[PDB]
Amino acid sequence: DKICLGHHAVSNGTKVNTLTERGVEVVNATETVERTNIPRICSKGKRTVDLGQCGLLGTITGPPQCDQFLEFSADLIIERREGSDVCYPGKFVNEEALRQILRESGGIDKEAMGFTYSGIRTNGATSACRRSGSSFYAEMKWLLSNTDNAAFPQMTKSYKNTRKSPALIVWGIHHSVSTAEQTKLYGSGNKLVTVGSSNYQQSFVPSPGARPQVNGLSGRIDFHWLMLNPNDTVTFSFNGAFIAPDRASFLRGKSMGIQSGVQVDANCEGDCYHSGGTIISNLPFQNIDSRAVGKCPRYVKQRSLLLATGMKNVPEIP
């Protein structure tokens, strides 16, 4: 008569690593590193906007591409590679800092700044901003002299933020293809634009000159921005080459922005994104994308790290 103590075992053993051994067989194991990607943006539960051809910074200035998004609202914001912030060729100064701000803004609320003009044209337009016909940035006014080569009057415009949130203010400096063109638009002489706040002081001079044709145009409009504190005032002093704002922007609340090249899905629910889709996993680590954002498992180099969920496998003596 005999009684033996034993433990189970299999022929289906899987190898893992320990402090000592490499490839020690255990009875059962599970993966800790996620590699399974969902090639969609799972947006269920999240108010989602697909900017498409609209560049994120364009939502503030308003090229034709962004007409739908001038006061957009979102929990999840998606930039696309085809997106463009611009109709008339140019770029923002400190663009990326501004993008990062808008990605978590929750969208924007626009409000008129109430600038009035006299002895001056405001209908500056271009073929590059076609909206039915030639037009311009929807939130901006392209100011000219009045006739041609005529002198541009020195002007001063101010705006106080009477709200409880900071106001996003944007203006543009126009760089003509030639001093001849600058003169034709704003008159002769040097041109100066000053922007004053109570925590901000900057200055701007235009730079006329030949540049490569972009959208058929060799002129550039570069945009500038500041955040205006509550009850603070911005003042604009200028005498030409100034792209004035018509409305200011106010951040709605909270959101998250991503850059992606895959479709959206409002059926799937997710919380960790990358340009290739959504990572839904309870696993502590992932090997899909290091730049993934949201609430994510930590990115690792290894594609697989097996965690033993069973004892060491010891084959039965046959």
Ligand X SMILES: *[C@@H]1O[C@H](CO)[C@@H](O[C@@H]2O[C@H](CO)[C@@H](O)[C@H](O)[C@H]2NC(C)=O)[C@H](O)[C@H]1NC(C)=O
The verdict on 201 binding other proteins (CB under 8 A) reads no
The smaller minimum CB distance to a second copy, of residues 42 and 170, is found at 170
Of 54, 121, 46, 102, residue with least CA distance to 225: 102
CA 72, distance to chain mean position in Å, is: 13
What are the beta bridge partners of residue 225?
A: 170
The verdict on 30 binding ligand X (CB under 6 A) reads yes
* C-alpha–C-alpha distance, residues 77 and 48, integer Å: 6
- Provide the mask over 47-86, with x wherever binding to a second copy is found by CB under 8 A and - wherever it is not: ----------------------------------------
- Residue corresponding to tokens 């433990």: 7
Contact 279, 100 (CB under 8 A): no
- Which residues, numbered 139-158, are part of the site for a second copy (CB under 8 A)? 156, 158
Residue count, binding to a second copy (CB under 8 A): 28
The smaller minimum CB distance to ligand X, of residues 68 and 309, is found at 309
The smaller minimum CB distance to other proteins, of residues 103 and 174, is found at 103
The verdict on 304 binding ligand X (CB under 6 A) reads no
The binder of ligand X chosen from 210, 263, 309, 311 (CB under 6 A): 309
- Which residues, numbered 59-118, are part of the site for other proteins (CB under 8 A)? 79, 81, 83, 94-101, 103-104
The verdict on 163 binding a second copy (CB under 8 A) reads no
* C-alpha–C-alpha distance, residues 313 and 9, integer Å: 6
Nearest approach in angstroms of CB 276 to ligand X is: 23
- Which residues, numbered 294-313, are part of the site for other proteins (CB under 8 A)? 294-296, 298-302, 305-313
Buried b (16+ CB within 10 A) or exposed e, 242-251: bbbbbbbbbb
- Which residues, numbered 223-242, are part of the site for a second copy (CB under 8 A)? 232-235, 237
- CA-CA distances (angstroms) from residue 102 to 74, 75, 245? 11, 11, 18
The smaller minimum CB distance to a second copy, of residues 242 and 273, is found at 242
Which range of residues in 44-52, 155-163, 239-247, 256-264 is near other proteins by CB under 8 A?
256-264
The verdict on 203 binding a second copy (CB under 8 A) reads yes
Nearest approach in angstroms of CB 27 to ligand X is: 8
* C-alpha–C-alpha distance, residues 192 and 184, integer Å: 16
How big is the chain by its Cα radius of gyration, in Å?
29
For 179-182, which contacts have Cβ atoms below 8 Å and span 24 or more sequence positions?
A: 179/208, 181/208, 181/219, 182/206, 182/208, 182/240, 182/241
Contact 149, 105 (CB under 8 A): no
Of 164, 71, 84, 74, residue with least CA distance to 112: 71
- Give the footprint of ligand X on this chain (CB under 6 A): 28, 30, 309
- Give the footprint of other proteins on this chain (CB under 8 A): 1-11, 16-22, 24, 26, 30, 32-33, 79, 81, 83, 94-101, 103-104, 256-259, 275, 282, 284-285, 290-291, 293-296, 298-302, 305-317
